[PDB]
Write a protein that binds this ligand. Sequence first.
Ligand SMILES: Cc1cc2nc3c(=O)[nH]c(=O)nc-3n(C[C@H](O)[C@H](O)[C@H](O)COP(=O)(O)OP(=O)(O)OC[C@H]3O[C@@H](n4cnc5c(N)ncnc54)[C@H](O)[C@@H]3O)c2cc1C
Length: 431
Amino acid sequence: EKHFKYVILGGGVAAGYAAREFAKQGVKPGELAIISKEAVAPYERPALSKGYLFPQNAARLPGFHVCVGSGGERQLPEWYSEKGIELILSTEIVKADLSTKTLTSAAGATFTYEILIIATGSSVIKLTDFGTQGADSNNILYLREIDDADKLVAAIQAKKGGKAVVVGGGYIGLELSAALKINDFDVTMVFPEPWCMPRLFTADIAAFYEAYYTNKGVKVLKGTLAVGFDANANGDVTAVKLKDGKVLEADIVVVGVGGRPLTTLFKGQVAEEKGGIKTDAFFETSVPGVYAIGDVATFPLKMYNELRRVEHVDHSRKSAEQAVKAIKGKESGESVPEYDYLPYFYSRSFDLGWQFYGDNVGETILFGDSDPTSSKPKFGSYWIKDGKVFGAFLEGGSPDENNAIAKVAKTQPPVASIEELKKEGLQFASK
Ligand SMILES: Cc1cc2nc3c(=O)[nH]c(=O)nc-3n(C[C@H](O)[C@H](O)[C@H](O)COP(=O)(O)OP(=O)(O)OC[C@H]3O[C@@H](n4cnc5c(N)ncnc54)[C@H](O)[C@@H]3O)c2cc1C
């Protein structure tokens, strides 16, 4: 049995950023441990569906370790060991007892703590949840962690020049379809929803991506459902069957149908809210000395006066800093300001790149040029509720223009006339 004053459970983005805050706050050797089921030090996860999948000049570790993704310094495994921070890799915790402050691994090793920081992220929803026949076939892959990314890279080489089907229509389904196309695959996207990224995109925003992807050679089958998979004598996938009877040939199948907060170890031990571990404005759970950050946390989103849960890389870096600041502040009888996060998400595929700030609530106003054949497309959208701008999206914006739409989402400016807003468009944020 090993004991540490602070234990971080998980080794992803929030864990790496929490360790950086711990080092900045002064942490003595032997105080902090990080237990991860992955075999590598914390890395910037968004790179896994972007640069990691490039056919040439691909991003590889140690290059994209935290905190380079936000302009910070790189944390190789040596960064942890030189500071006396024990990085405990390839160790999966299968039991957590908050009353006895004990975590147990699959091989039976036990770890105790004084402060626990839950940073377990999300697990992928598999097609087994829907009872999809043949979902267990080989070459049917998911993409969450670097292990999956290495498997995907290897399968891309083995089946290069063949047919790929991506199941899912969110930003992951779009990013993986783009990745398979640039790796010389014949790619089809199947998703039951009427348009891609239906949780954020409107039909107007999605129409641009659908037409852009079609020009790139991708077949976007919206309003389509994969009901089964054919496999050969070897067990490898050979086809994806759809609800309508149509069959698509497939050498590889990549799935991106979402995830769920990885809160299993603590069910019944902590208060929950909307699928996440409920926390206050400092990320502390219903259990004193237990904190929850990143994807797992359902926290007060101060500017919206509601409890919210997000799958954002900015939130994962920021909530980690906030939780450590609160823990270290408490040691000196000090308090820290309440977490004031502005929702921010971004995606990348082909030569495109969009940014989203705020809340996608109310009615939307599309501005700019949404022609997918244009050499430099630049369009966006504003979300208006109660006569104020709540959300802002922009594809093809510059650093100045992205800061302008982030400024608009933060200040929630009044829209006196939507006729004037439709006249100014992006200039409304830029002025
Ligand atoms: C492929 C991909 C692309 C993305 N692209 C974007 C993007 O463009 N923009 C954006 O804003 N966000 C993006 N995201 C989301 C963003 O990366 C996440 O929100 C962020 O990584 C979550 O931080 P986290 O610390 O909460 O979780 P994670 O980064 O997932 O870390 C959780 C860690 O806990 C570990 N763990 C879990 N359970 C256990 C256990 N029992 N024992 C030990 N270790 C355990 C996991 O192995 C992992 O290391 C992307 C995510 C993925 C998967």
